[PDB]
Design a protein around this ligand. Structure first.
Ligand SMILES: NC(=O)c1ccc[n+]([C@@H]2O[C@H](COP(=O)([O-])OP(=O)(O)OC[C@H]3O[C@@H](n4cnc5c(N)ncnc54)[C@H](OP(=O)(O)O)[C@@H]3O)[C@@H](O)[C@H]2O)c1
Ligand SMILES: CCc1nc(N)nc(N)c1OCCCOc1cc(C)ccc1N1CC(C(=O)O)C1
Length: 166
């Protein structure tokens, strides 16, 4: 349960088996089951994203519906129509339950405050290239549940992980 006086922080991402989450301003695969899962978990909560993740959303789609959208930027003139731009996690994490939805920089930034990670891993062979955005590495304080490999309508294997810590 999430008490309303708390500030729970979760991270949610989809990665290739290499840990790649982003390349060239996009995600280098498509998996409908991951889109459905991401929406099931985040719906109704505040979502926090880095400015480059906001940029990666088509203008017509953003802000993402059904969730309070918060974007992190250090640029005083960056504006996100329909959403709030703040300069720090201190300002972004005021809700009782917040999902950090990427990208690579913001996962690393939020990791010290997070107590849950929800991961989709896609069995697509995409080795890491310079400039890629990557999933955060999780130390031994994080305890994980790994699901069995499942198979997408799109013909890719995928599996879910849930990590927690105190
Ligand atoms: N597979 C997934 O689950 C997933 C999820 C989300 C995104 N992605 C992909 O990941 C990539 C984007 O990730 P990324 O690592 O390049 O960028 P990002 O984390 O989305 O955004 C980085 C931006 O966030 C701001 N930022 C970073 N640290 C900050 C801090 N301490 N305080 C205030 N603002 C801060 C900065 O904006 P300013 O430069 O404006 O100051 C920085 O440029 C894209 O390819 C995207 O498609 C994948
Ligand atoms: C779904 C990708 C994803 N997957 C997981 N597991 N974690 C994340 N943080 C995550 O990136 C969330 C931000 C990027 O978003 C999208 C990206 C693409 C290529 C297709 C659909 C969406 N979606 C936002 C729209 C919505 O949510 O309404 C549908």
């Amino acid at each position: 349960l999430v008490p309303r006086g708390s500030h729970m922080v979760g991270l949610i991402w989809a990665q290739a088996t290499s840990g790649v989450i982003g390349r060239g301003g996009d995600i280098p695969w498509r998996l409908p089951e991951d889109q459905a899962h991401f929406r099931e978990i985040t719906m109704g909560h505040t979502i926090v994203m880095g400015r480059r993740t906001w940029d990666s959303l088509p203008a017509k789609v953003r802000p993402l519906p059904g969730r309070r959208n918060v974007v992190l930027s250090r640029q005083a003139d960056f504006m996100a129509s329909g959403a709030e731009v703040v300069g720090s996690l201190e300002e972004a994490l005021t809700s009782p339950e917040t999902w950090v939805i990427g990208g690579g920089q913001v996962y690393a930034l939020a990791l010290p405050y997070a107590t849950r990670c929800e991961v989709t891993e896609v069995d697509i062979g995409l080795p890491r290239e310079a400039g890629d955005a990557l999933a955060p590495v999780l130390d031994e304080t994080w305890r994980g549940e790994t699901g069995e490999w499942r198979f997408s309508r799109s013909g890719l294997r995928y599996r879910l992980y849930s990590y927690h810590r105190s």
